[PDB]
Amino acid sequence: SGFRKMAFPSGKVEGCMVQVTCGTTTLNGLWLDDVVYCPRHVICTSEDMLNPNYEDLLIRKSNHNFLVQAGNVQLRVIGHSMQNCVLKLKVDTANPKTPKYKFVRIQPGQTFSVLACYNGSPSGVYQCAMRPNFTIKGSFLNGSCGSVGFNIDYDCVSFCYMHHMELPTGVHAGTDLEGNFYGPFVDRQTAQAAGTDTTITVNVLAWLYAAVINGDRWFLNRFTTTLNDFNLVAMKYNYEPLTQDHVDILGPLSAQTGIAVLDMCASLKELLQNGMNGRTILGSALLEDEFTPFDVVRQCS
Amino acid sequence: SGFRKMAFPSGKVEGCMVQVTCGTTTLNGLWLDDVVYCPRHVICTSEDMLNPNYEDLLIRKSNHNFLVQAGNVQLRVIGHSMQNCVLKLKVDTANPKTPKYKFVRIQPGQTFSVLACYNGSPSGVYQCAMRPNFTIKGSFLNGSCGSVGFNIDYDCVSFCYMHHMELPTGVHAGTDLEGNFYGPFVDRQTAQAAGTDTTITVNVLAWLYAAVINGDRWFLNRFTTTLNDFNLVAMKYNYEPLTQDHVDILGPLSAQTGIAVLDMCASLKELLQNGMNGRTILGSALLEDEFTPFDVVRQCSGVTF
Ligand SMILES: *[C@H](O)[C@H](CC(C)C)NC(=O)[C@H](CC(C)C)NC(=O)[C@H](CC(C)C)NC(=O)OCc1ccccc1
Ligand SMILES: *[C@H](O)[C@H](CC(C)C)NC(=O)[C@H](CC(C)C)NC(=O)[C@H](CC(C)C)NC(=O)OCc1ccccc1
Ligand SMILES: [Cl-]
Ligand code: NA
């Protein structure tokens, strides 16, 4: 029993983290096989942070301009290429610690673990979710760029996020490992702002099911709702629409608890209307939306 | 910016986890040098778990009764002994992945990372605190026994917890790596309960400092209090007493933010007596007490391991 925000063990990723320095900028890179992936803005200077021409900056670089350090070992760069907003540095040695891995681009509402790193060394590991507005709510300081997000279902590391930037509300933006930003952001210091964020409804429902699995029922009620009436109410609290895909996805947790999905929607409706009246659910006084249905099944079963 | 419940990187510990099987019970062990440590109740039967005489149950056991698997490799047990509630299985091979480590016993209010494991395979990592009632609010399923808690201090892993059991409220109990239970618990399936818990005051104060450092300031006020006055409020609201040593420990955060501890205590006093008036702090509608002062300084300064 118990329910915690649980990250994947980070050791398979720790063994991939390196430090990349170009000029006076240092950040982190991800060393897989004979390639180091990092944010391409490591090649910016303080003059071209607003409108960098990355193609023009990179053609001027020599391999020896990139200083890549893996623990105490300098790696030798022997070539390079840019893919969207990620730089791929070819090195003369393959990482002997390369795990089984893949690259996946995730959808809003998905969760992943972040291994926050500075100067190529790990600081800690935590769980995040891709918000509906394509930001994440991380914990990142100066130097954290190139830190990655990942899942490790089974024995394979799925890399889904590389950190690039912080926006004015203190939230974070980045790319997949093919260098495509999540959301409309660009790796330029021109004014940008995250959209109004919303709550990941399907994830809240999953967590309410987790609460029932863990022995709590105080928030249930005798009512039900149609899907459309649920979405008309949830709208008014800045909740994301619940789709029929989401209802299907909750089917297994529904079967395990005996609570029909639309009956759980009626419970959520009442919680939005009433609040918790001094009670908690799974140790929280707010409705939690950074556990997916898959996460709940992973941790409870 | 940002502030998250953050665990230590777990790689040094992942290389130490093994599977231990005795009879029909399988749980986890910790392989360090040429010893595997695991809960002694691995030796208990389905027919005999209510009032075990562990002394007597182990002499019947011999070495090849314990099946130890590191990944897909069997380790040969060559000796066995008991220390308090932990079994020590001597194996024929030293763990080549043994990190720099030590065994430590922590105090209530201290936090640590838990590497939850099943069948010798790490499955997840999360941050916990030793509650004042000596339980932890973990997440553990059948087969999780022998999962370990730890901190990292520079390059050294400090192991502080091994998981043994679940209490009726859904909270968890275990031992240090010398086999001493935390709390007034015993390793048998007799009636036991967690005591009434309290809130870890010095940790709440640390988390309020983290909030200020991240720009959440609405709860600050002009007032100050004294240690004596605040501790009466703390007692009243089932908060742990605040000692002068706690005040000194928070000193750094006090200097950095310009809010003296007794200044911040007057904020916490007001949040206890009046509540949050609908607002949140660092994304929480409750007062969070599982960040230590060290945890806050570490995360807010980017310390690495
Ligand atoms: C890499 O380690 C670092 C991580 C941050 C968490 C500090 N990223 C950057 O420095 C990044 C480089 C640019 C070229 C992508 N810049 C930012 O993240 C920057 C904030 C820094 C200076 C603290 N954000 C930014 O420029 O956002 C756009 C913007 C500009 C002006 C007004 C609003 C928004
Ligand atoms: C080890 O994998 C496992 C971890 C649990 C989280 C499943 N530990 C046990 O099975 C443990 C062994 C005993 C000898 C300490 N037993 C328990 O933890 C047990 C709950 C299990 C069956 C889920 N709880 C227990 O013994 O609590 C005391 C108790 C018993 C009966 C009535 C009141 C209190
Ligand atoms: Cl996805
Ligand atoms: Na004050």
From Swiss-Prot, chain B:
**According to the UniProt entry, how is activity regulated?**
Inhibited by pyridone-containing alpha-ketoamides compounds 13a and 13b. In turn, alpha-ketoamide 13b (tert-butyl (1-((S)-1-(((S)-4-(benzylamino)-3,4-dioxo-1-((S)-2-oxopyrrolidin-3-yl)butan-2-yl)amino)-3-cyclopropyl-1-oxopropan-2-yl)-2-oxo-1,2-dihydropyridin-3-yl)carbamate) inhibits SARS-CoV-2 replication in human lung cells. Inhibited ex vivo by michael acceptor inhibitor N3. Inhibited ex vivo by compound 11a and 11b.
Q: Which residues lie on this side of the membrane: Cytoplasmic?
A: 1-305
- What is known to happen upon mutating Q189A? Does not affect ability to cleave and inactivate human TRMT1
Crosslink (Glycyl lysine isopeptide (Lys-Gly) (interchain with G-Cter in ubiquitin)) position: K5, K90
Q: Can you tell me which residues form the catalytic site?
A: H41, C145
> Residues in domain Peptidase C30?
1-305
Compartment(s) where it occurs, according to its Swiss-Prot or TrEMBL record: Host cytoplasm; Host Golgi apparatus; Host nucleus
User: What does the record give as the reaction this protein catalyses?
Assistant: TSAVLQ-|-SGFRK-NH2 and SGVTFQ-|-GKFKK the two peptides corresponding to the two self-cleavage sites of the SARS 3C-like proteinase are the two most reactive peptide substrates. The enzyme exhibits a strong preference for substrates containing Gln at P1 position and Leu at P2 position
Q: Which domain of life is it from?
A: Viruses
Job description of the protein = Cleaves the C-terminus of replicase polyprotein at 11 sites. Recognizes substrates containing the core sequence [ILMVF]-Q-|-[SGACN]. Cleaves and inactivates human TRMT1, preventing tRNA guanine(26)-dimethylation of tRNAs. May cleave human NLRP1 in lung epithelial cells, thereby activating the NLRP1 inflammasome pathway. May cleave human GSDMD, triggering alternative GSDME-mediated epithelial cell death upon activation of the NLRP1 inflammasome, which may enhance the release interleukins 1B, 6, 16 and 18. Also able to bind an ADP-ribose-1''-phosphate (ADRP).
Quaternary structure, per UniProt, is: 3CL-PRO exists as monomer and homodimer. Only the homodimer shows catalytic activity. Interacts with host FBXO22; this interaction promotes the proteasomal degradation of nsp5.
According to UniProt, the name of this protein is: 3C-like proteinase nsp5
Q: Which organism is it from?
A: Severe acute respiratory syndrome coronavirus 2
Full-protein residues shown here are 3264 to 3568 of 7096
